[PDB]
Write an enzyme that holds these catalytic residues in place. Structure first.
Site, short mmCIF file in Angstrom:
data_model
loop_
_atom_site.label_atom_id
_atom_site.label_comp_id
_atom_site.label_asym_id
_atom_site.label_seq_id
_atom_site.Cartn_x
_atom_site.Cartn_y
_atom_site.Cartn_z
N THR A 156 46.48 30.98 14.02
CA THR A 156 46.75 30.44 15.21
C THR A 156 48.12 30.25 14.79
OG1 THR A 156 44.23 29.09 15.74
CG2 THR A 156 46.43 28.29 17.03
N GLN A 157 49.04 30.42 16.37
CA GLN A 157 50.41 30.62 16.06
C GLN A 157 50.80 29.59 17.11
OE1 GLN A 157 52.52 31.37 13.70
NE2 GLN A 157 50.25 33.15 13.46
N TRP A 209 46.34 24.07 13.48
CA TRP A 209 47.65 24.00 13.96
C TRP A 209 47.19 21.76 14.51
CZ3 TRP A 209 52.42 24.03 15.27
CH2 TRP A 209 52.59 25.61 15.44
#
Lengths: 230, 222, 207, 231, 234, 243, 203, 241, 208
Positions: free
Chosen positions: A1-2, A111
């Site tokens: 996940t960015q 995140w």
């Protein structure tokens, strides 16, 4: 996940004379759209542990699945798993921190910011923070997101140092937590009226007060404000 | 794996398979190299049946004996290498170089699966020289130059004939010596004339017949 | 790769001898050059593994030489990673983790040690040991002669006497070779002159 | 017979000969005794020397402060199994801060050893191990065999002539398990048990090796001068 | 000991694999109607402690394809799982439901692969696929451990294969598909051939019936089998 | 005989002899049984006391998979542990892709594929254990018994090991006597009696009885071990029925 | 730009029964002219391949097609025809779809069996541009397209085909900065090939 | 598969024996076409023999027939099609000529003859095809990978008798219909059982068949030269026979 | 017994002889087996010449790779060690024994070595390998002296040819000689040179 898409805003927690109290609102926000209001971000992992998670909701569900798998695999070939050699808060936190740091190192980070709160079998309170970068620390009071700024001062006013923990009873800590929820609801745009609260006590075990309401709101002073300037 | 006393089983048996295969004959001249094969059936298609002599490059040819199936693999290996050499260097392969590569590919299968049951004669001319070249190879993966040599099932006989039969002077004597080796050992013969400037030609049945009838007239004379 | 019903898994070489003492460890090897043309100086039956560890072998067959290279790499990488010379027992374990061998050397942990690999690969620390076809005769003399107060000077003559007793040819500075490891000098090989004067000392003892 | 030479072949009677010969491999090795009380676990080993001039084999391997083991049979297989156990306990400590429970370690070694007894090309481990440790659930003692079987025990002895030691341990079971508050008598009972397996030899300051772990005792190995008080 | 040519040119290992197909000692039948295909196979429950619902050799391979296996049940289940995987793979890869005969062909190819590579033994099973094809209508395709397969007008397999085959041959010669008008009628017809050929009357527990129809292959339950049996008794 | 030194071989009779030799290994194992309830399944197994040194009630032989599957086996115990480990990772994978706990029939299929795979290749040995497993899922209780050959069926009651014949006879009499089915509470005691009767032909050595069970009502659908009061009630019932 | 760095021109035309392919001889690095002997027309039997673009790729493809066409000739026992060669070049160019040669090839020849003139062009990654009249590639693609369109007409005999193609190339090159230093024109027939060097501006 | 002390490859001869145990198959070259014929056996009267064709298309210009183990032929055929497309047509935009495809199939079968863990294929093929350059072709490919072109040939259990009959009948001036007549007679003389359009099957490599091309409006494309003769087409010839 | 059979294969290879002088090392072979590995070093082998090709090519590649990894060329010791290492790694194994001789970079001492299928290698002042190696070695032991070594190239070539002529049938057509000299001054003796020395020794052999 960015990038986080759907997120839970904040979690706060503090340790009192006999255990730890932790709370989190039930709202997952899609940007500024308060999209999902039924999310549960406090994850019990036993009678002695509850895990609060913030950040991406999908990564939160992944972490919840990881915790379920931990509980499942601990019981394999472990005849004592239900009373001793059970999963302590320390083991849960250490596994989560290892996973989070490894994901960070592979440039594929979860995140999330995770507060693992509980009590060890020896009765000592466990309360530690870990975030996506693998940064970990412990404190008498912990908070995530806007809680680290808004709520955390309020909790620290109650237990400012380790010497204050035995002086803090259940009611004092719960009042502090509820007041912190009310303040965060006032000032955090991502927050919600509904929140869950979990109490782990070395004597009475895990109490999990779900879908609490923010109450005693103060708005009646708003009638006197007449816009900008005049 | 080695046999006791230092033999190698599979190479010996591949040599047996070569010995039971059809023959391949070669003769090198002063100005040309001639390779000859006996074709050794009434319904087999003569028009399109491949000749045993095969081109490996524009200037070099290969002839084989033994298992026909393995000859194709060996020939394609040699062709691929000959073209790769020109990919890496401008100059085409020398005949020595090509025989060395085919010896290596034959050898590698003996130590690595079964050896190729093939032995070969290699002929050609260097890319910008003019000296005749003729070389031999066998399953063990060893090679040597020759003035005239033969492989196959008649070798034990025709080899002494060729020893009995100062290299020959001109292409007529070269083809005559080849056909006389084929005929003296007992007209259905392939003859391929290799000449510098990449002129590689197979003699027609009527040309073969002309030479054969002349040589039979000589044989009648004694 | 298969046990026998008795629980076990399914000697002709040249002799090597070694003695360990409070002062040092001495090693000796039969050279036995097969021809006067052969370069006797090129028979390296004793090699250095590290500046304080040497190995005496029945024969430097390529299987032995690969093990020598692995042991040298282990010692050098231990120095690289720990900035300290490898301990003898640790080196023997690393080699075991990888022929009759006398691994011998010095360290500050256990002082002076000599190690011999039993046929199952298990290293045993020894006070004195011999290998090769000469071990059968040598072992009794080693059991007889070793004593706790043995000096290095006496140990050199002991190993030389074993070589004289078992070897097929009269001792000289060329047909037999000695080496020793000392705390101050490290692993070193006795030159032909020192071997020669030790042989003359042996002769004087005989006289 | 024709079924002996491969690990993946059952005999007509369903026996795995290649594993029973691994058991014979332990039957070749020297005796090592283990026993426990509710608070302490003890290992006792009779070491072997190749020659009068040779030192003895170390038969006790320390994993860490809470666990260790002893050997019977092929030492290199013991090296491999012990380093695998070390890897597992170390992984547990790094990833969970959790002391690897002794039963978990026993079953991990069981699982690893079983693999060699089912796949072709692998050889059964020709070594048996006694594993002792102390954790949140008290003192433990385990017996490991090549077949993969792992057994939790009050006491046991593996190696040559261990049957006499096991008979003595069975006789005195009701006694040594009662030993409380002190390790001395437990070690004394262990050395008395191992003494049953001696023929033409006796316990000496150089033959004997003793180890112990417990509530107040991190895993320690007594040898040489230290073991003189028990011999 | 391995799948290699004997000097006679025969593969003795594959021939042994054929003989393994009779270990279960159960017979099967497949027949084609005008609009349906039916399977009849003996369910033999030797032990009373077994759960009869779980004892089965008829497999639902896809929505349309059903399969019937004779031989050891472990190999039968391995083949059934492989066939299900192949059918899902085809539906994914080529965008439409797998034809019955094309599945028969890939299963035959896969079986032939074992018949040539010595690494693995052949499966000792004979597979019978049944369907109402989207284009070709009712289909029966029996497959052999040798990698040989062929479509059938009707099929019987098992220890008493020859008797059922003879009865089917006689019926067809006296009449390519069964003229019945509904799938129940052809199921009853096949049950009557089982009754006559084997000379045995079946209880509702002794029979398995799989019926292939447009966009539905399904297996009859015990009470449906009882319905068919009473209709025969009628 | 011949044709039995290798695993991937058919004899002229079409028989995989190595698989049968593995089956004969199961026949030397201690007796283990399983019984289906009206709302659950019960597992029991003999544990022979080789010596007094064994710690009582700690060398367990029944194993859980995931949380709702119970496994018990007889034969080469480490082979059973290997099979249970594979079953555990298969259940984990299923619970990862999907979310419902792996259905008992699905788990049985997975284990049958794994065990049958070991009978395909020359390079791997067949499993030397016959495993009885089952559990509770959305469709009630299931009980399966899986053989070295990879074959398995759903069972009302199953028994494997040395005493399998008498245990099977008593299970038949059990299901005959209880046409309305067993409750979990009844079945625990009943399985204790069955195990005690099974040992009677294997009475040369002492033994310990281990029992486990899963039920919709009495465990809320999770596999659990018999302990304490209920365990002792079962023991007294079994001994009384034997006396 | 790899295609513009070295410049160079290639043009092909079809006569009544003959083909002509012509190229300039300049090789350089943008401004600087390096060599006047970089002939971009290669032949493999009776089929001619002209290649413009990055000169390293021109040489690499000359070697590659020499190798592949020699193997084809040996294992087929017949020379590769213009159509088959066009397909081979197209397949070889697309093989490096993501790492392509920066070239524009142009095939020209006469099919030996049918005897019909054939010409085709390509892009960087093998888009076949089969055309019946004429093919153009290089830095002066625009000039050459206009010039050939103005001059070319069907069924030119070899002499007039030579004149037309030579004039098109000359006038196109005189208006391209990165092209010139002489040109070579091949006139290809069913039984012979004529190579001619054209006089032109040397700037 | 290794050399025996006598120099023969050991297991290949067993594959040849398996081929000899196969049913008879034929090939005949006319000046203007090629015929390949074979009888198809049946496992039972219930089996739909029309499901399986022993003759199969490799390329629109090339067809194959076999004697020996059928499954081996089937896998070798789809391997042959895969190589004919991926290795030749994907590159050159045209189908490989009979010589090239025969060489690739021979390579496929020879790899098994020179590789461990796999037995040789138990089928001999007759690969008929046509080329614009080589013309019509007929090749017999043996289990060893050795292939030789034939004017006319027969394989299977009837090999020797059929060969001796073809040697009599074949001549340099046969037209395709004369070749079909000779093939029908030869295969009828070899079939011991019933002989009709359903037990025999024929295919021809003859003139272009635009009726089978499946589309119109492209003058350049020609259409398959390979085509099977239907049961009715064969019955017509056997009735006219 | 695999390496034993490999050694038996060595016993059937053509004989090769090497002699080291004060300033020269000379290799002789029965009727070029002596092949140059690097400018300053050569390799000679006896046994299966088919298996020798892989060894030669690996040695050449290693010599060039060493010259590429270190600025200095390979020493004869290094090349001998590499030949032994490779020849071990295939233990079917190579049925070949070898000699390695030459000079080290900017060196003055000729080097000569022998290597065996066992992977054993040792330095020799003179050595033989091949079918009749025992007789030639016995002949050398009574004609070479460590305490009276050859002084000049002429002495080295004379001794090598004399040793080979012990068993060789006809020297002019049945032996070959190569002379290795410092700083890559390696040369191979031509027909007229070898015949000159052969006749010089022949004039004496007939007299006794």
């Amino acid at each position: 996940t960015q990038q986080p898409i759907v997120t839970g805003t904040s979690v706060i927690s503090m340790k009192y004379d006999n255990g730890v109290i932790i709370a989190a609102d039930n709202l997952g926000s899609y940007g500024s759209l308060l999209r999902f209001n039924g999310v549960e971000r406090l994850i019990p992992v036993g009678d002695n542990t509850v895990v609060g998670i913030s950040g991406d909701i999908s990564d939160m569900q992944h972490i919840e699945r990881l915790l379920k798998d931990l509980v499942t695999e601990n019981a394999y070939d472990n005849p004592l798993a239900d009373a001793e050699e059970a999963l302590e808060p320390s083991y849960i936190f250490e596994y989560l921190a290892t996973v989070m740091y490894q994901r960070r190192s592979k440039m594929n980070p979860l995140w999330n910011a995770i507060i693992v709160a509980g009590v060890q079998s020896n009765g000592d309170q466990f309360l530690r923070y870990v975030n996506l970068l693998g940064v970990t620390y412990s404190s008498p009071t912990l908070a995530t997101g806007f809680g680290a700024h808004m709520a955390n001062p309020l909790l620290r006013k109650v237990v400012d140092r380790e010497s204050d923990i035995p002086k803090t009873t259940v009611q004092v800590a719960e009042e502090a937590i509820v007041n912190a929820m009310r303040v965060l609801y006032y000032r955090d745009a991502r927050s919600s009226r509904n929140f869950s609260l979990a109490i782990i006590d070395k004597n009475t075990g895990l109490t999990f007060k779900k879908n609490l309401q923010v109450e005693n709101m103060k708005w009646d002073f708003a009638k006197d404000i007449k816009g900008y300037g005049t | 794996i080695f046999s006791p006393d230092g033999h190698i089983f599979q190479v010996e048996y591949a040599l047996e398979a070569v010995k039971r295969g059809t023959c391949a004959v070669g003769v090198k001249g002063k100005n040309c190299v001639v390779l000859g094969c006996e074709r050794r059936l009434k319904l087999q298609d003569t028009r399109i049946t491949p000749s045993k002599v095969s081109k490996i490059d524009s200037h070099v040819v290969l002839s084989f004996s033994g298992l026909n199936a393995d000859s194709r693999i060996l020939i394609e290996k040699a062709r691929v290498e000959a073209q790769s050499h020109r990919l890496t260097l401008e100059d085409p392969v020398t005949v020595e170089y090509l025989t060395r590569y085919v010896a290596g590919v034959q050898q590698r299968y003996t130590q690595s699966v079964r050896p190729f049951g093939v032995s070969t004669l290699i002929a050609g001319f260097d890319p910008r020289d003019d000296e005749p070249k003729l070389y031999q190879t066998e399953p063990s993966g060893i090679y040597s130059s020759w003035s005239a040599q033969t492989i196959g099932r008649n070798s034990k006989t025709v080899r002494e004939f060729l020893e009995k039969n100062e290299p020959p002077a001109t292409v007529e004597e070269c083809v005559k010596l080849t056909v006389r080796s084929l005929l003296e050992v007992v007209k259905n013969i392939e003859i391929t004339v290799v000449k510098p400037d990449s002129d590689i030609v197979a003699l027609s049945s009527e040309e073969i017949n002309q030479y054969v009838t002349q040589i039979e007239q000589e044989k009648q004379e004694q | 790769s298969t046990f026998s019903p008795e629980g076990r898994l399914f000697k002709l070489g040249s002799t090597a001898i070694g003695i360990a003492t409070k002062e040092g460890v001495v090693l000796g090897v039969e050279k036995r050059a097969t021809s006067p043309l052969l370069e006797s100086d090129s028979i390296e039956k004793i090699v250095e593994i590290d500046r304080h560890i040497g190995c005496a072998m029945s024969g430097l067959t390529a299987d032995a030489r690969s093990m020598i290279e692995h042991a040298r790499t282990a010692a050098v990488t231990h120095n690289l990673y720990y900035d300290e010379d490898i301990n003898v027992e640790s080196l023997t374990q690393s080699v075991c983790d990888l022929v009759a061998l006398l691994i011998a050397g010095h360290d500050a942990d256990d002082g002076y040690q000599l190690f011999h690999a039993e046929p199952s690969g298990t290293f045993y620390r020894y006070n004195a040991k011999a290998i090769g076809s000469g071990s059968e005769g040598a072992q009794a003399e080693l059991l007889n002669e070793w004593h706790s107060s043995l000096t290095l000077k006496e140990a050199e003559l002991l190993v030389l006497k074993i070589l004289k007793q078992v070897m097929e040819e009269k001792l000289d500075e060329n047909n037999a070779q000695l080496s020793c490891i000392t705390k101050q000098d490290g692993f070193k090989i006795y030159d032909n002159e020192k071997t020669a004067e030790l042989i003359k000392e042996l002769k004087e003892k005989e006289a | 017979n024709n079924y002996d030479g491969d690990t993946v072949t059952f005999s007509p009677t369903g026996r795995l000969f290649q594993v029973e010969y691994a058991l014979e491999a332990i039957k070749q090795g020297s005796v090592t005794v283990g026993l426990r009380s509710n608070t302490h676990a003890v290992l006792v080993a009779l070491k072997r020397n190749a020659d009068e001039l040779s030192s003895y084999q170390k038969k006790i391997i320390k994993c860490d402060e809470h666990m260790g083991l002893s050997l019977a049979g092929l030492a290199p297989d013991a090296r491999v199994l012990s380093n695998y156990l070390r890897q597992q306990c170390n992984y547990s400590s790094l990833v969970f801060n959790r002391k690897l429970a002794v039963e978990r370690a026993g079953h991990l070694l069981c699982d690893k050893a079983q693999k060699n007894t089912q796949s072709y090309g692998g050889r059964p481990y020709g070594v048996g191990l006694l594993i002792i440790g102390y954790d949140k659930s008290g003192a433990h003692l385990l017996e490991f065999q090549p077949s993969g079987n792992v057994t939790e025990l009050y006491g046991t002895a593996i190696g040559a002539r261990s049957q006499g030691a096991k008979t003595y341990l069975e006789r005195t079971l009701d006694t040594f398990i009662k030993i409380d508050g002190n390790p001395d008598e437990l070690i004394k009972a262990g050395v008395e048990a191992i003494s049953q397996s001696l023929r033409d030899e006796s316990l000496t300051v150089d033959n004997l090796s003793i180890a112990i772990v417990g509530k107040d005792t991190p895993f320690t190995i007594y040898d040489g001068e230290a073991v003189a008080k028990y011999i | 000991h391995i799948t290699i040519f004997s000097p006679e040119g025969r593969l003795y290992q594959v021939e042994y694999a054929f003989k393994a197909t009779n270990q279960t000692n159960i017979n099967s039948l497949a027949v084609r109607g005008k609009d349906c295909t039916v399977v009849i196979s003996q369910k033999k429950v030797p032990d009373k402690l077994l759960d009869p619902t779980t004892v089965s050799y008829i497999f639902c391979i896809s929505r349309t394809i059903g399969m019937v296996v004779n031989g050891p049940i472990p190999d039968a289940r391995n083949a059934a799982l492989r066939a299900k995987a192949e059918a899902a793979e085809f539906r994914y890869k080529y965008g439409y439901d797998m034809p019955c005969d094309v599945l028969a062909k890939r299963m035959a190819n896969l079986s032939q692969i074992y018949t040539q590579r010595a690494y693995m033994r052949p499966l000792g099973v004979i597979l019978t696929f049944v369907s109402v094809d989207e284009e070709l209508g009712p289909s029966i395709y029996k497959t052999d451990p040798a990698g040989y397969y062929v479509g059938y007008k009707a099929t019987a397999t098992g220890p008493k294969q020859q008797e059922i085959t003879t009865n089917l041959e006689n019926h067809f010669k006296k009449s390519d598909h069964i003229n019945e008008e509904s799938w129940e009628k052809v199921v009853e017809f096949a049950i009557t051939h089982m009754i006559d050929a084997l000379g045995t009357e079946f209880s509702k527990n002794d029979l398995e019936v799989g019926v292939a129809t447009k966009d539905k292959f399904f297996t009859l339950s015990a009470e449906n089998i009882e319905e068919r049996l009473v209709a025969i008794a009628e | 005989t011949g044709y039995d030194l290798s695993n991937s071989v058919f004899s002229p009779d079409g028989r995989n002899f190595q698989v049968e030799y593995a089956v004969k290994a199961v026949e030397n194992g201690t007796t283990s049984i399983g019984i289906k309830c009206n709302d659950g399944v019960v597992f029991a197994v003999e544990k022979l006391i080789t010596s007094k040194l064994l710690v009582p009630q700690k060398n367990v032989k029944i194993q859980v998979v995931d949380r709702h599957i119970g496994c018990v086996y007889s034969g080469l115990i480490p082979d059973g542990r290997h099979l249970v480990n594979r079953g555990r990772e298969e259940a984990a994978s299923f619970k990862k892709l999907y979310k419902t706990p792996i259905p008992i029939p699905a788990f049985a299929d997975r284990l049958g594929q794994y065990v049958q795979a070991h009978t395909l290749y020359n390079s791997v040995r067949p499993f030397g254990v016959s495993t009885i497993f089952g559990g509770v899922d959305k469709n009630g209780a299931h009980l399966y018994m899986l053989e070295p050959s990879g074959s398995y069926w759903g069972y009302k009651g199953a028994a494997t090991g040395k005493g399998r014949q008498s245990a099977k006879a008593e299970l038949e009499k059990l299901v005959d006597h209880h046409p309305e089915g067993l409750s979990a509470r009844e079945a625990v005691k009943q399985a204790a009696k069955i195990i005690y009767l099974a040992h009677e032909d294997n009475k040369e050595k002492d033994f310990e009885l281990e029992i486990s069970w899963c039920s919709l009502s009495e465990t809320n659908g999770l596999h659990k071990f018999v302990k304490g009061d209920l365990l002792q009630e079962a023991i007294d019932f079994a001994q009384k029925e034997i006396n | 730009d790899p295609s513009s760095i070295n410049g160079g021109i290639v043009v092909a035309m079809t006569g009544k029964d003959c083909v002509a392919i012509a190229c300039d001889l300049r090789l350089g690095s943008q401004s600087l002219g390096v060599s006047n002997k970089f002939e971009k027309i290669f032949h493999y039997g009776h089929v001619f391949l002209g290649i413009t673009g990055l000169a390293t790729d021109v040489t690499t493809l000359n070697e590659m097609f020499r190798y592949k066409t020699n193997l084809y000739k040996l294992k087929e026992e017949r020379a590769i025809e213009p159509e088959t060669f066009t397909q081979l070049v197209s397949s070889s160019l697309y093989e490096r779809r993501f790492g392509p040669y920066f070239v524009g090839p142009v095939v020209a020849g006469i099919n030996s069996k049918s005897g019909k003139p054939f010409i085709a062009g390509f892009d960087l990654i093998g888009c076949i541009d089969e055309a019946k009249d004429f093919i153009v590639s290089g830095t002066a693609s625009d000039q050459l397209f206009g010039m050939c369109e103005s001059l070319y007409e069907p069924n030119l005999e070899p002499e007039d085909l030579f004149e037309t193609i030579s004039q098109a190339l000359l006038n196109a090159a005189d208006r391209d900065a990165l092209s010139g230093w002489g040109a070579v024109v091949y006139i290809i027939k069913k039984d012979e090939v004529v190579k001619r060097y054209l006089k032109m501006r040397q700037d | 598969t290794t050399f025996s002390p006598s120099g023969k490859l050991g297991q290949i001869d067993y594959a040849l024996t398996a081929v000899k145990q196969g049913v008879t198959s034929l090939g005949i070259k006319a000046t203007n076409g090629v015929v390949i014929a074979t009888e198809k056996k049946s496992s039972s009267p219930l089996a739909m023999s029309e499901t399986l064709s022993k003759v199969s298309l490799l390329t629109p210009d090339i067809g194959a027939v076999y004697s020996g183990m059928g499954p081996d032929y089937r896998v070798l055929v789809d391997k042959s099609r895969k190589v004919a497309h991926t290795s030749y047509k994907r590159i050159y935009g045209e189908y490989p000529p009979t010589k090239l495809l025969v060489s690739e199939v021979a390579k496929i079968m020879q790899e098994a003859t020179q590789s461990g863990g796999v037995r040789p294929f138990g089928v001999s093929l007759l690969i008929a095809g046509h080329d614009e350059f080589n013309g019509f072709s007929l090749y017999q490919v043996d289990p060893s990978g050795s292939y030789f072109p034939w004017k006319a040939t027969a394989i299977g259990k009837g090999s020797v008798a059929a060969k001796t009959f073809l040697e009599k009948r074949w001549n340099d001036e046969l037209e395709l219909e004369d070749a079909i007549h000779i093939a029908l007679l030869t295969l009828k003389e070899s079939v011991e059982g019933e002989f009709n359009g359903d037990t025999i099957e024929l295919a021809i490599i003859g003139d272009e068949n635009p009726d089978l091309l499946g589309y119109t409006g492209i003058p350049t494309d020609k259409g398959p030269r390979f085509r099977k003769l239907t049961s009715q087409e064969i019955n017509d010839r056997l009735e006219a026979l």
